[PDB]
Design a protein around this ligand. Structure first.
Ligand SMILES: Nc1ncnc2c1ncn2[C@@H]1O[C@H](COP(=O)(O)OP(=O)(O)OP(=O)(O)O)[C@@H](O)[C@H]1O
Ligand SMILES: Nc1ncnc2c1ncn2[C@@H]1O[C@H](COP(=O)(O)OP(=O)(O)OP(=O)(O)O)[C@@H](O)[C@H]1O
Ligand SMILES: Nc1ncnc2c1ncn2[C@@H]1O[C@H](COP(=O)(O)OP(=O)(O)OP(=O)(O)O)[C@@H](O)[C@H]1O
Ligand SMILES: Nc1ncnc2c1ncn2[C@@H]1O[C@H](COP(=O)(O)OP(=O)(O)OP(=O)(O)O)[C@@H](O)[C@H]1O
Lengths: 353, 55, 220, 278, 51, 74, 188
């Protein structure tokens, strides 16, 4: 009964209007602060005595009065898409074992990614500067977002998710300044890891001068490239990138410094195909007879994806046979045939480097 | 005579230069001026409302 | 012991006073979540959050008033009335017009009985669409991953559109038509937020079915 | 009243008390391009008088090109150890706002605090983003920012005569740059970073290897031999990839194994099967 | 043109002479309109002499 | 063709529903429409004038009850 | 001048009618309907508002994405307005007036017979096919040497009886800044 009156008394405090945000450009005096609103207009105001004048500093997010237009309260930093870049989730861990190959790539990115974090000493002794970047590309094969995804959910620490389609921004390519601010919050939560999916479009060449989109895209690219040309230490931030074709990425990204490492996925060997087939035979209930070398002999040149879809094709073809446990003869039939249909639709899998 | 000293007050002294977007049979015409300003204006004066045409 | 009804009278009178601040949660606004406490210069504690506007502007307010930061992570659409700069109610959901509702299908009258000669490939289709609906328990028994994308190709006709939309009317589940070139837009990457909104309302209406044609128009 | 001046707005100046990174002793390749940077930067910076005496007018316009390899911004990082002056570090894109009217305030402030701090130096990295022709009003705000390029261009005629500014600039592609800038009278200096040669090879090998623990087995001559037949590069970060094939281990003092294996690691693309023309 | 005192003009001109002069058209009639406003006038071809 | 008049007077009469004046209009257009048998032209080409027309058309100017049918002699 | 005299003399009643319904700025489409009374709305002012309607409008007349009039201060929906379109391009294509009647055909009969009964007969006598239905075909095609193309179209204009038809030239579809002709063809 009385708790309600507590809420209603809270409304009495809600009779106070929200204040207006702004930035601190400079300060002319103690009663003259050169400020700007997030909406563009600039102002000069004094302020009350609850501030610490030195704490103010230029380039400071503050809140202003609705009439006096002066600082009462302030907050250091804010960013909307960040927590959503941190909200990615992936199972595994164990999937890092489930992927099969590729071993030397797995351990390679484990070293150049994880090792600068935990052991800067090994690097600083030999005199070598740690690589700040890496590149992945399929689908000559596939497993990019899988592997790197299980590295994000594997190493944990701090990690940032980026799809290349969120930098679109429509008017005023300030998704550029979202790359700047995003890198600043990567300097906040550092050490951090950066995903980059589908980097071809946000990596284009501006070969032929044309239209508008290509130009402002190239502008955000200038932001990227010059923030990897620092003027800044990116040691503590990691960047992982995946795209179809390593062709349109321009020599600026192809240049070390900005992009130190280059690693690819290749079509899985019948050994790795064997292994991933093993881990894909686990969840599916099977008949007592199992022979993997049948499918390994028959299946050649598939993606790892095409192979797991081949296993699912076996089982979902086996829902017609209505058997709970299913023989691998039905798997040889449906796997073989429908797999070869995938290979008839496998047109133009041959990509540049 | 008196009409010249009348309609000028209503339209005076300042008036914006607008652009006719489309016409509704109410004599209300959806209009457009910088920026994104639509509206309904029913007037019988100076018109010529047939020959206006959008744009 | 009867004074509890007196406080009841004042909480209802204040609720009536809340109604005048509840009319209307006019302006739509975007949120940036924050929980902050400001020491001085003696002490002031609580929660304070950041807010955008429909007019692209941004404010900073002591936490609403009515509902608390229980909702949400930085959201939007929170209803706030003009100069109040306080949110009486947090409203959903999402957006937007043509993008929100591209298609809402009652049902086309035709069914698979109107076509013939496809019994094998319509067995494959009726498989891929029907087996997650009713037979999901069979999958969890066998440990099966159902299919998602299913490619449909051939020169008209065929008549694969009457196939997909007929059996789509036989699904009774939520169904959204879509045209391929619709994703071509006026500004950079509008089609992106378009498709994300599509799959968001699809995930809301789950299970559902979305049919697109002329993918090769936008898939070059 | 007006700005004090100059109290900004934005940017701001400095950040160069916590910077630059390392001194010009890093790179030893150029020795000529660095001399044009020398006479075109800090010979005018120390003497405005000797020019009027000898009767030759020094331009403030500086333009660098040729990448990759990098060069470029490392000459600025090295200039901040050379010189004590003003330093403007602005990404060519960084200033594009929601309101076109913010551009002129930003760049105008840049120039009035530049001449306020004169002797001064201003650097904009890759204006190629803002150097292309465009019409439509949406990007027409950016047509107002190339009108801003012409604004600050008129102001770059306004620094003359004498005191002062140094406008240095670089780009990854200079094709689309509209000639009004480069055309004589404003930016008069065209600098081109050359691909490293045998001098630049040996100098870059020595300077990068001086910062790593190296074995007495490792030879620099064979790698100014076979990679010099093709590369090219970026040679620096390729030796860094050698120390990084040492950082593949668990390694003590790097061997020619990780060197040669890093030169074949990054990179060789062979042309051609069809090369039998020759 | 300096000793003749007639106003001196070089042809396109980029990019931004399409801005100041006219909107979009053949545009040499609008440039020719400027040359009609200021007469006598010299039009130079700048430069398009290149390899 | 008479079908188009049939469709216009057929669709406009769907309203009101009666509103018997619609069953008055459907015959109204076909007075002159299906009357025929006389061409005018003007009346007339010889420069006389129709006497029933001016007469009758002067009364319904304040049209009230049966004056419209008196004029409907036409 | 007399017509302009009476034209300018109606402003006295016009200003009395000018006080009400003027607030119609601006046209606005809704986005969702929160509850029974309340509708969230977006206006090209780019501000967005949740509000009711002017109670003379029946609340069941509103649909999602419906351009509706407004009282700007209350922001309430004033009147639902049907048109959401159109850029002048389509009404530029909207066609009127006949010319070049049938007998202007140059003796082509089977052609003119088929391309005639395919449009007139279903449109002139719809009940006939509904009786025999079946169905008349969706559309037709013409082509050949220039003589005579597009002129039999003019004949379709002449013999056209009641419902107007919209001519569409070929080039107005293609425009630069891609995605324009799409909106075009869709909205037409
Ligand atoms: N080596 C692998 N081990 C396990 N699963 C794999 C492997 N390679 C691909 N897959 C399967 O492929 C699917 C997609 O993951 P992946 O990151 O390969 O997509 P992708 O590489 O972006 O595809 P594409 O390159 O064809 O666009 C996953 O469901 C995954 O199970
Ligand atoms: N095998 C068939 N069975 C039943 N109907 C058919 C068959 N082939 C063609 N049709 C008929 O042809 C008509 C035209 O359909 P059409 O072939 O254009 O559809 P579609 O090709 O699937 O659509 P789209 O052209 O977008 O691919 C349909 O009304 C359909 O009834
Ligand atoms: N002696 C040298 N010769 C060439 N490059 C070097 C030398 N020493 C260091 N570098 C490279 O220069 C890079 C930094 O240069 P900078 O920041 O100027 O890039 P940039 O010139 O903007 O890039 P780019 O010119 O490729 O677009 C370092 O990553 C380093 O690998
Ligand atoms: N068979 C015909 N009957 C009547 N008139 C004809 C015939 N052939 C040509 N003409 C006359 O010749 C003129 C030119 O033909 P028209 O321009 O209509 O064809 P077209 O428009 O060139 O065809 P297309 O649209 O394929 O270019 C027309 O004005 C028409 O009156």
């Amino acid at each position: 009964t009385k708790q309600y009156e507590k809420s209603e008394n809270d409304l009495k405090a809600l009779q106070s209007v929200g204040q207006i945000v702004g930035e601190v450009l400079k300060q002319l005096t103690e009663e003259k602060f050169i400020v700007k609103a997030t909406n563009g207009p600039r102002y000069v105001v004094g302020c009350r005595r609850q501030l610490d004048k030195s704490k103010l500093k230029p380039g400071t997010r503050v809140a202003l009065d609705m009439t006096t237009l002066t600082i009462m309260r302030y907050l250091p930093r804010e960013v909307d898409p960040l927590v959503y870049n941190m909200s990615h989730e992936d199972p595994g861990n164990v999937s890092y074992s489930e992927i099969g190959g590729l071993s030397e790539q797995i351990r390679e990115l484990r070293e150049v990614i994880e090792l600068p974090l935990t052991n800067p000493e090994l690097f600083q002794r030999v005199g070598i500067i740690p690589p700040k970047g890496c590149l992945l590309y399929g689908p000559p094969g596939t497993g990019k977002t899988l592997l790197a995804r299980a590295v994000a959910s594997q190493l944990d620490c701090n990690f940032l998710k980026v799809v290349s389609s969120s930098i679109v921004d429509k008017y005023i390519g300030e998704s550029a300044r979202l790359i700047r601010e995003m890198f600043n919050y990567a300097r906040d939560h550092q050490p951090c890891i950066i995903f980059m999916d589908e980097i071809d479009a946000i990596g284009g060449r501006r070969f032929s001068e044309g239209t508008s989109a290509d130009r402002e895209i190239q502008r955000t690219l200038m932001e990227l490239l010059n923030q990897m040309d620092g003027f800044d230490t990116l040691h503590r931030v990691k960047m992982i990138m995946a795209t179809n074709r390593p062709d349109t990425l321009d020599p600026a990204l192809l240049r070390p410094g900005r992009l130190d490492r280059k690693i690819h996925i290749d079509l899985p060997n019948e050994q790795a195909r064997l292994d991933i087939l093993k881990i894909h035979a686990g969840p599916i209930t099977k008949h007592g007879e199992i022979d993997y070398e049948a499918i390994v002999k028959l299946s050649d040149g598939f993606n790892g994806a095409d192979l797991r879809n081949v296993c699912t094709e076996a089982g979902m073809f086996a829902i017609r046979a209505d058997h709970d446990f299913v023989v691998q003869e039905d798997f040889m039939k449906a796997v073989r045939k429908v797999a070869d249909s995938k290979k008839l639709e496998s047109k133009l899998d041959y990509k540049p480097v | 005579e008196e009409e010249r000293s009348k309609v000028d007050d209503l339209r005076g002294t300042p008036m914006s230069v607008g652009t006719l977007e489309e016409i509704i049979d109410d004599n209300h015409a959806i209009v457009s001026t910088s920026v994104g300003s639509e509206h309904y204006v029913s007037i019988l004066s100076f018109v010529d409302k047939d020959l206006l045409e959008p744009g | 012991t009867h004074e509890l009804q007196a406080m009841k009278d004042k909480i209802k009178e204040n609720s009536e006073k809340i109604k005048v601040n509840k009319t209307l949660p006019y302006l739509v606004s975007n949120v940036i979540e924050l929980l902050d406490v400001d020491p001085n210069d003696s002490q002031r504690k609580g929660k304070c959050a950041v807010i955008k506007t429909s007019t692209r502007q941004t404010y900073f307010l002591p936490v609403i008033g009515l509902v608390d930061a229980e909702k949400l992570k930085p959201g939007d659409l929170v209803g706030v009335n003009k100069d109040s700069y306080l949110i009486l109610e947090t409203l959903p959901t999402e957006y937007d017009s043509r993008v929100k509702a591209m298609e809402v299908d009652e049902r086309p009258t035709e069914q698979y009985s109107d076509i013939g000669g496809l019994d094998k490939q319509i067995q494959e289709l009726v498989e891929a669409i029907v087996l997650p609906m009713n037979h999901k328990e069979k999958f969890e028994n066998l440990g099966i991953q159902p299919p998602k994308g299913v490619l449909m190709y051939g020169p008209p006709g065929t008549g694969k559109t009457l196939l997909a939309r007929a059996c789509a009317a036989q699904t009774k589940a939520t169904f959204l038509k879509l045209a391929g070139p619709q994703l071509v837009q006026m500004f950079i990457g509008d089609g992106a937020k378009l498709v994300r909104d599509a799959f968001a309302l699809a995930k809301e209406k789950a299970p559902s079915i979305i049919f697109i044609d002329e993918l090769d128009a936008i898939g070059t | 009243d007006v700005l004090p001046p100059e109290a900004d707005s934005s940017i701001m100046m400095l950040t160069s008390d916590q910077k630059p990174d390392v001194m010009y002793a890093d790179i030893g390749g150029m020795d000529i391009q660095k001399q044009e940077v020398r006479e075109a930067v800090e010979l005018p910076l120390t003497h405005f008088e000797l020019y009027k005496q000898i009767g030759i007018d020094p331009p403030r316009g500086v333009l660098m090109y040729g990448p990759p390899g990098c060069g470029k911004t490392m000459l600025a990082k090295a200039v901040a150890h050379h010189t004590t002056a003003a330093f403007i570090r602005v990404v060519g894109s960084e200033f594009v706002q929601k309101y076109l009217g913010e551009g002129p305030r930003m760049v105008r402030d840049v120039f009035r605090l530049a001449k306020e701090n004169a002797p001064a130096i201003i650097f904009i990295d890759e204006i190629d983003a803002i150097a292309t022709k465009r019409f439509d009003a949406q990007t027409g705000a950016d047509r107002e920012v190339q009108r801003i390029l012409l604004e600050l261009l008129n102001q770059m005629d306004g620094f003359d005569q004498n005191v002062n500014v140094k406008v240095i600039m670089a780009t990854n592609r200079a094709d689309t740059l509209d000639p009004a800038l480069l055309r004589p009278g404003r930016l008069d200096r065209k600098i081109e970073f050359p691909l490293p040669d045998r001098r630049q090879k040996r100098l870059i090998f020595s300077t990068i290897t001086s910062k790593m623990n190296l074995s007495e087995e490792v030879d620099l001559e064979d790698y100014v031999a076979r990679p010099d037949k093709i590369s090219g590069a970026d040679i620096n970060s390729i030796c860094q990839e050698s120390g990084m094939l040492a950082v593949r281990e668990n390694r003590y003092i790097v061997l020619a194994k990780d060197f040669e294996k890093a030169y074949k690691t990054v990179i060789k693309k062979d042309e051609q099967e069809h090369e039998f023309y020759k | 043109a300096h000793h003749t005192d007639c106003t001196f003009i070089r042809v396109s001109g980029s990019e931004l002479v399409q801005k100041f002069i006219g909107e979009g058209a053949r545009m040499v009639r609008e440039l020719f309109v400027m040359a009609r406003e200021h007469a006598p006038s010299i039009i130079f071809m700048d430069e398009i002499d290149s390899i | 063709p008479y079908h188009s008049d049939r469709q216009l007077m057929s669709q406009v009469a769907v309203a009101g529903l009666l509103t018997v004046l619609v069953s008055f209009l459907d015959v109204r257009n076909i007075i002159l429409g299906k009357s025929h048998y006389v061409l005018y032209g003007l009346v007339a080409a010889m420069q006389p004038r129709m006497l029933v027309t001016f007469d009758e058309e002067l009364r319904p100017l304040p049209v009230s009850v049966r004056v419209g049918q008196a004029v409907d002699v036409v | 001048a007399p017509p302009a005299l009476w034209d300018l003399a109606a402003d006295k009643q016009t200003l009395q009618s000018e006080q009400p319904l003027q607030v119609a700025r601006c046209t606005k489409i809704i986005n969702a309907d929160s509850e029974d009374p309340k509708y969230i709305i977006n206006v090209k002012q780019f501000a967005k508002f949740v509000v009711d309607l002017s109670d003379q409008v029946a609340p069941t007349d509103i649909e999602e994405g419906m351009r509706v009039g407004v009282d700007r201060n209350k922001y309430q929906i004033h009147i639902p307005l049907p048109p959401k379109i159109d850029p002048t391009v389509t009404m530029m294509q909207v066609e009127e007036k006949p010319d070049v009647t049938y007998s202007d055909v140059g003796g082509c009969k089977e052609q003119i017979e088929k391309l005639r009964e395919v449009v007139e007969t279903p449109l002139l006598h719809p009940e006939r096919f509904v009786n025999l239905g079946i169905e008349p075909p969706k559309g037709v095609l013409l082509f050949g040497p220039p003589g005579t193309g597009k002129t039999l179209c003019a004949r379709a204009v002449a013999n056209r009886t009641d419902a107007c038809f919209i001519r569409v030239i070929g080039s107005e579809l293609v425009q630069k800044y891609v995605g324009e002709g799409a909106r075009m063809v869709r909205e037409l």
